[PDB]
Design a protein around this ligand. Sequence first.
Ligand code: 0LB
Length: 215
Amino acid sequence: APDSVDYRKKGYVTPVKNQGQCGSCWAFSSVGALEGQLKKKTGKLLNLSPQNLVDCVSENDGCGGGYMTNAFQYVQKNRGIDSEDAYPYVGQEESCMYNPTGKAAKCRGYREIPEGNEKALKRAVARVGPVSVAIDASLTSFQFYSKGVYYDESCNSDNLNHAVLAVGYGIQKGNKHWIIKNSWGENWGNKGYILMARNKNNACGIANLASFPKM
Ligand SMILES: *C(#N)C1([N]C(=O)[C]2[C][C][C][C][C]2C(=O)N2[C][C]N(C3=[C][C]=C(F)[C]=[C]3)[C][C]2)[C][C]1
């Protein structure tokens, strides 16, 4: 595998979004991974609808939270997901209003990275594209991230409370990292991104709930 990978450089990653008050991080993570595969498969980058997921993935809890795998399984069984333009984000759960006419992507299933395996996660990012991951994002130190490679010994890998997108990996000044796209707006972090410690005993649980869609 390459020493570093950054899918932003290749137009596989849409702008950083802001989930607002809704607990829809799982939907932004899912859409990010789907977006990556859509660009890879069709050459077109577009915003897909996290609202479609919030409203229509019955296995998840809308703004109460959710699993990205349930989201990929929905898109698969539904035979599509709408674009953001066709099904805009409103930041509160509403009735499912999926419209096949606005369909922008399909899913043929998903793959999960073995729990805890950062080497497998690295391989997946290198081979497939951006990968949905879950982390402990609860710490104040995480809130206040500005630059460098984030590591906090207090991060709890058993408390996966937030879903984000691994769009690459690399090394900065000797510190191996994951390139993580968050959904807290471009004002948070470093332009909406965080570099998170890689190969540091699965810091923040980065490799405990990772998955990507098939297309
Ligand atoms: C974001 N924003 C939020 N976080 C999550 O959704 C995280 C993402 C990583 C996995 C765990 C998930 C989560 O908080 N939940 C899992 C699914 N839950 C659920 C509840 C009821 C139901 F019928 C089905 C699923 C809720 C908890 C912060 C919200």
